[PDB]
Scaffold this active site. Structure first.
Site, short mmCIF file in Angstrom:
data_model
loop_
_atom_site.label_atom_id
_atom_site.label_comp_id
_atom_site.label_asym_id
_atom_site.label_seq_id
_atom_site.Cartn_x
_atom_site.Cartn_y
_atom_site.Cartn_z
N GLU A 8 1.25 -3.43 70.67
CA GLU A 8 1.87 -3.26 69.29
C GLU A 8 1.30 -1.66 68.90
O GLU A 8 0.74 -0.82 69.49
CB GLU A 8 0.93 -3.73 68.25
CG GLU A 8 1.18 -5.31 68.37
CD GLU A 8 2.58 -5.68 68.00
OE1 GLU A 8 2.84 -5.61 66.95
OE2 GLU A 8 3.38 -6.08 68.98
N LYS A 46 -11.11 2.70 40.11
CA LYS A 46 -10.21 3.53 40.94
C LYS A 46 -9.76 2.80 42.27
O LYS A 46 -8.73 2.68 42.63
CB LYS A 46 -11.08 4.65 41.23
CG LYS A 46 -10.19 5.97 42.08
CD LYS A 46 -10.98 6.75 42.82
CE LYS A 46 -10.19 8.04 43.22
NZ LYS A 46 -9.69 9.02 42.14
#
Ligand SMILES: CCCCCCCC/C=C\CCCCCCCC(=O)OC[C@H](COP(=O)(O)OCCN)OC(=O)CCCCCCC/C=C\CCCCCCCC
Ligand SMILES: CCCCCCCC/C=C\CCCCCCCC(=O)OC[C@H](COP(=O)(O)OCCN)OC(=O)CCCCCCC/C=C\CCCCCCCC
Ligand code: HEC
Ligand code: HEM
Ligand code: HEM
Ligand code: HEM
Ligand SMILES: CCCCCCCCO[C@@H]1O[C@H](CO)[C@@H](O)[C@H](O)[C@H]1O
Ligand SMILES: CCCCCCCCO[C@@H]1O[C@H](CO)[C@@H](O)[C@H](O)[C@H]1O
Ligand SMILES: CCCCCCCCO[C@@H]1O[C@H](CO)[C@@H](O)[C@H](O)[C@H]1O
Lengths: 241, 49, 380, 61, 101, 80, 55, 54
Positions: free
Chosen positions: C272, C228
């Site tokens: 940022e 997964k």
């Protein structure tokens, strides 16, 4: 805040995620830079060798660099001296230092153009608009002595006098040197100077997607295949009730 | 009592080949596994590249 | 000693009890995939990072061009540089979902796993902050100058603490160097702490969407989750690469293609994206000191979440009220992010303060309150 | 039946599975590259140096 | 009036843990008290809850739920643990209070 | 050692088939999609709202900002 | 390859600085393994005979 | 420190000469390397002589 006009979006031949640069247009651009801009604009990060296999032949390149004299040294006596360029040299700076540059351009400082299309919002679309877009100031606006009006440049008063005009040079490939043709080619060249990896980078993106789509699908099936055991599993409660 | 216990019907999920309760499932086994493994073997090749 | 080596060996035993025979609930969803991604994400930064460090020069006179020379002359330098740069965003994107998941499913109730978690976040922030100065571009320098100077508002020991950090009177070469040092260091501390994170985690085992004991149905990590997670790795990795390769600078300020210059302040100095949300809360409070604290609190608030859980249930799966409140908060963070990107003028300034207020109100008052109300509606 | 055969000769024995993955890769590379390069170039006819090279490649001065 | 009853039934249906076949008490977070409480449940009730819970998990992993017919109806939701849990807490508060004196 | 000391479980039978006797992605239309939709419906009115309510605020705040940049002729009507 | 060129030059200096910063931390990691294996048996002792009778 | 052929040597020098206790730190680090080996050599020796390698 303040007023500003944003450039439009021209359909560059290299705007497509899978579309490369038109090296012919780039080759022209190099000329435009070499014969016009290089007069005041430095391009510190590009070297003549960089052209080889991109826009010129190893031979043409060797020639283009010999057209310049560079400063090497010191010699046996510790003096500096001149010599004809090699492909290992980087495009010549027009001025010794910024102070000298400002001095010859009315205190204004023509920025190095190595990363300009990435240093300004809009890149080519902006640089292109700026170049072609000079015009007279609208009513009520006065540009101080020495600057020129450009609605595309913030403040609208730019220290750079319109640099290109029809037939200001002749593309040796036989291309009608109309002012817009020039700006267009040079802008295309600036894109390349800013990032030579352009084409290779995009060619990789292609490969990345194909593999990506293939690998993902495969791992989805595998994931499902293992999980199936649980997904369909059935249970029941059976007390001796 | 355990005698009263039966496995439910997995028709809804069984593969095409093992759908009929009166057909040996072994004959289509090599196919069923060869496929799945084929998918996996491929994933490796991709990854390797 | 024992039958199979996987359990006896002093080392395999470790790899086994945490990646192969580890008991995992059977019903965990995609939201649990972020742990592994954060991990991979980390291993990836460090790899690309080292590769870039082997060509970088930490000196005001060479930083900018060392980075440039790397992208321009080093085989695949351009690619590594990109991967590293964009990797940082993929990192935060992931960490923000990881946290979110935690909040919505009351994972924080695993206090120690959670608290180390907050520490990982804080560390990652410092790391990504110093990292950004390394290319010494306009924004690198200027952001560094504004952000670090913030501390100067701290009383009495303010200025001292800053000039100390700077190694001088302003962000200059002595800063660039110590930052490069810090940037190289912190990642490794992250790795270490991640081990602690997973160590506490393993005491209890994973939580699960329904929030009820999953002992009656656990499954071996491998192949179920190994598979997964490898799937979730490619599912995210695609957009990452698609971006990193087709729209490289989609997220970066063009102002950073201009060598730092102390005599030209850029028009809009902002950090940022992954920081904006807090930069926003910073400007909400007019008062250099209060705004700093508000900033600090914006993140340190995570340490209180565990003590603000009033619901008789763990997750929000069965708490619709808390659910809208949760998505409100998310949306709220989105807006805060947005505000951080815009200038300091009307109508932004006010929207800012509003969002900043709703932020703390939701976590400090609404959530625990709506939580209690929800208990009464269940007849608890 | 290839699936059946494939399974028998290639996927059954772990050792042969590995051999398949390798040789499979070697051939996949060779073909995936050539193909993609091919696609990329057609998509960019006349823009690449590869295309305009002839004009200066022993045809000037 | 029946305002309080309207709300509860609404919230009960709003929560939706009954679509999994779970009972209000099945969703209780297992803190220290709930833990002791469960240990006191008679075996038959314990085993039943266990099945219910395990069944709910299986639905969750499957991304499904029980057919509408099988959903727990507000009025038939048996509060099997609540009584125990209350005494467990009564007891604690006694001790907590006594150790203080 | 975590497998064996987990829980006291009694009387629950489960049945499952090897991954090879069954389909990986089965009943896509009969079961899969219908549920995808089901799940999508149950949530929209919980998530969507505050996100839409965000967009608006964004649009307003954006447009208003631009508006305040435009000039109001009512400042120059009497500037002969 | 290692030199990053044709002789020990700048490209070497940098990658060495990198390696020199890195390695120490690998040492620390490995030291944990070292002591981990060590603890399985416990320390040895000068007389070389079982010290369980007196720890 | 600066890792550049043109600055390495002098960055180290500048460290010992201008950085508060730079000289001390530089020494401790440098000599520390030997103390390290001296120690590791005895650690190994000890192991060989007492069959710790078993
Ligand atoms: C912080 C800085 C801000 C930056 C923003 C980060 C990026 C935000 C992108 C938006 C997120 C899009 C997610 C869409 C998923 C929607 C969805 O599927 O919702 C329904 C679904 C139903 O849940 P159940 O009740 O368990 O149902 C079980 C039945 N099977 O809900 C969930 O998946 C659970 C929610 C987990 C996702 C949360 C991610 C949001 C992240 C933002 C950060 C917030 C936290 C605080 C950070 C402080 C710093
Ligand atoms: C040109 C190429 C030439 C070079 C050759 C090198 C390649 C050599 C590879 C060796 C072959 C591997 C042997 C595998 C054998 C083990 C095995 O059982 O298969 C793997 C096994 C499968 O189980 P079964 O289907 O049940 O197998 C039944 C067998 N009868 O486990 C797996 O799922 C592994 C395969 C999937 C890999 C997924 C990886 C996805 C990652 C993608 C990101 C991209 C990569 C970047 C790497 C980062 C490096 C810095
Ligand atoms: C006579 C010298 C000169 C020539 C020739 C010239 N420029 Fe410039 N250029 C300048 C000056 C001066 C500036 C600085 C303007 C300012 O910052 O006020 C400038 C600035 C620029 C800028 C934009 C600066 C900004 O802040 O947006 C670009 C882009 C540019 N030039 C492009 C070109 C290109 C392309 C050419 C060749 C077609 C060219 N220039 C030729 C002098 C020149
Ligand atoms: C360096 C960053 C981090 C790494 C690599 C990391 C890794 C992991 C891993 C591998 C898991 C297990 C799988 C999963 O549930 O996703 C996990 C779980 C968890 N992490 Fe992190 N984590 C990080 C940051 C954080 C942060 C910032 C927090 C929150 C403040 C946090 C909180 C948790 C919690 C509560 C769990 C429990 C999950 C559950 O509910 O079962 N983690 N983390
Ligand atoms: C924790 C993971 C990391 C994060 C989040 C991170 C983040 C960053 C960021 C945001 C930058 C600026 C990129 C740019 O826009 O130019 C950067 C640059 C850099 N980082 Fe990292 N980094 C990490 C780890 C590392 C590590 C471990 C090294 C190597 C020891 C490293 C070495 C560098 C170098 C040399 C640069 C400068 C070159 C450049 O700017 O591209 N990084 N990093
Ligand atoms: C980074 C270097 C190293 C560190 C920090 C380290 C640390 C230790 C420590 C803390 C001990 C326990 C106390 C003691 O007996 O000294 C130990 C034991 C031991 N170490 Fe190391 N060690 C290192 C290198 C080595 C090397 C190079 C060898 C040999 C090839 C070695 C062989 C052993 C052995 C065999 C023991 C068992 C001692 C006994 O006979 O009881 N170590 N080491
Ligand atoms: C344009 O294309 C690029 O040209 C390069 C050569 O200059 C090659 O090395 C790259 O693989 C190729 O994609
Ligand atoms: C998800 C995994 C994505 C990996 C995709 C591998 C694609 C990178 O492949 C690259 O393509 C370039 C273009 O021709 C070549 O020049 C490079 O040598 C090659 O390594
Ligand atoms: O050996 C020791 O073994 C312990 C048990 O695993 C670890 O916790 C220690 O860190 C390690 O040094």
């Amino acid at each position: 805040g303040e007023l500003e006009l944003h450039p439009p979006a021209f359909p560059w031949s290299h705007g497509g995620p899978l579309s490369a640069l038109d090296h012919s247009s780039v080759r022209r651009g190099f000329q435009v830079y070499k014969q016009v801009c290089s007069a005041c604009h430095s391009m510190d990060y590009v070297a003549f060798r960089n052209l080889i296999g991109v826009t010129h032949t190893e031979a043409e390149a060797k020639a283009l660099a010999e057209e310049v004299e560079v400063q090497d040294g010191p010699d046996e006596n510790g003096e500096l001296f001149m010599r004809p360029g090699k492909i290992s040299d980087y495009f010549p700076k027009p001025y010794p230092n910024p102070e000298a540059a400002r001095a010859a351009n009315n205190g204004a400082l023509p920025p190095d153009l190595s990363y300009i299309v990435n240093a300004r919002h809009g890149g080519e679309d902006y640089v292109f608009s700026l170049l072609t877009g000079y015009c007279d100031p609208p009513a009520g606006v006065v540009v101080r002595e020495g600057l020129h009006y450009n609605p595309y440049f913030p403040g609208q008063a730019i220290g750079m006098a319109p640099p290109i005009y029809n037939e200001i040079l002749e593309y040796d490939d036989g291309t009608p040197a109309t002012m817009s043709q020039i700006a267009k080619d040079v802008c295309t060249f600036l894109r390349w100077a800013a990032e030579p990896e352009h084409d290779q980078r995009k060619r990789m993106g292609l490969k990345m997607l194909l593999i990506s789509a293939l690998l993902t699908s495969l791992l989805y099936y595998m994931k499902r295949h293992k999980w199936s055991v649980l997904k369909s599993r059935k249970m029941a409660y059976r007390p001796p009730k | 009592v355990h005698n009263d216990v039966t496995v439910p019907d997995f028709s809804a999920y069984r593969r095409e080949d093992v759908m009929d309760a009166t057909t040996s499932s072994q004959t289509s086994s090599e196919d069923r596994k060869g496929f799945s493994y084929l998918v996996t073997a491929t994933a490796c090749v991709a990854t390797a590249y | 000693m024992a039958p199979n080596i996987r359990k006896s060996h002093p080392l395999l035993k470790m790899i086994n009890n945490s990646l192969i025979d580890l008991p995992a609930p059977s019903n965990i969803s995609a939201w649990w995939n972020f742990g592994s991604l954060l991990a991979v994400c980390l291993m990836t930064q460090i790899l690309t990072g080292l590769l870039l460090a082997m060509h970088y020069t930490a000196d005001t006179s060479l930083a900018f061009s060392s980075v440039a020379h790397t992208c321009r002359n080093v085989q695949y330098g351009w690619l590594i540089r990109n991967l590293h740069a964009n990797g940082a965003s993929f990192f935060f994107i992931c960490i923000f979902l990881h946290i979110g998941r935690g909040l919505y499913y009351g994972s924080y109730l695993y206090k120690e796993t959670w608290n180390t978690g907050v520490i990982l976040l804080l560390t990652l922030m410092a790391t990504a902050f110093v990292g950004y100065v390394l290319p010494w571009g306009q924004m690198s320098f200027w952001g560094a100058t504004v952000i670090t100077n913030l501390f100067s508002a701290i009383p009495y020991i303010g200025h001292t603490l800053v000039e100390w950090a700077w190694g001088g009177f302003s962000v200059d070469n002595p800063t660039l160097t110590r930052f490069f040092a810090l940037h190289f260091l912190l990642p490794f501390a992250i790795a270490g702490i991640t081990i602690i994170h997973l160590t506490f985690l393993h005491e209890s085992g994973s939580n699960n969407p329904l929030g009820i004991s999953s002992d009656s149905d656990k499954i071996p990590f491998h192949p179920y989750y190994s598979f997964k997670d490898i799937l979730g790795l490619t599912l995210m990795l695609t957009p990452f690469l698609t971006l990193a390769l087709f729209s490289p600078n989609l997220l970066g300020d063009p102002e950073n293609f201009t060598p730092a210059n102390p005599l030209v302040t850029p028009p809009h100095i902002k950090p940022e994206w992954y920081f904006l949300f807090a930069y926003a809360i910073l400007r909400s409070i007019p008062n250099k000191l209060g705004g700093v604290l508000a900033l600090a609190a914006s993140v340190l608030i995570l340490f209180l979440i565990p003590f603000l859980h009033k619901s008789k249930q763990r997750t929000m799966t069965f708490r619709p009220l808390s659910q809208t409140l949760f998505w409100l908060l998310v949306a709220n963070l989105l807006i805060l992010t947005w505000i951080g990107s815009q200038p300091v003028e009307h109508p932004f300034i006010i929207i800012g303060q509003m969002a900043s207020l709703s932020y703390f109100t939701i976590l400090l008052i609404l959530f625990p309150t709506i939580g209690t109300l929800e208990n009464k509606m269940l007849n608890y | 039946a290839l699936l059946r055969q494939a399974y028998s000769a290639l996927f059954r024995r772990t050792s042969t599975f590995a051999l398949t993955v390798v040789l499979g890769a070697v051939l996949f590379e060779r073909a995936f590259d050539q193909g993609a390069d091919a696609i990329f170039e057609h998509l960019n006819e006349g823009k690449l140096w590869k295309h305009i090279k002839h004009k200066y490649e022993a045809s000037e001065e | 009036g029946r305002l309080m009853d309207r709300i509860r039934k609404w919230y009960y249906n709003a929560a939706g843990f009954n679509k999994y076949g779970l009972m209000r008490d099945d969703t209780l977070y297992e803190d220290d008290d709930v833990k002791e409480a469960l240990k006191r449940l008679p075996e038959d009730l314990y085993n039943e809850r266990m099945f219910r819970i395990k069944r709910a998990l299986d639905l969750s992993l499957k991304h499904r739920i029980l057919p509408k017919e099988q959903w727990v109806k507000y009025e038939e939701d048996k509060p099997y643990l609540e009584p125990y849990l209350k005494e467990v807490i009564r007891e604690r508060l006694e001790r907590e209070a006594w150790n203080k004196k | 050692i975590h497998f064996g000391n987990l829980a006291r479980v009694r009387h629950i039978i489960t049945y499952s088939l090897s991954p090879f006797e069954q389909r990986a992605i089965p009943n896509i239309f009969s079961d899969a999609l219908p549920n995808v939709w089901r799940r999508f419906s149950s949530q929209v009115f919980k998530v969507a709202p505050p996100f839409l309510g965000a967009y608006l605020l964004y649009s307003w705040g954006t447009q208003e900002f631009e508006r305040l940049k435009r000039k109001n002729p009512a400042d120059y009507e009497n500037d002969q």
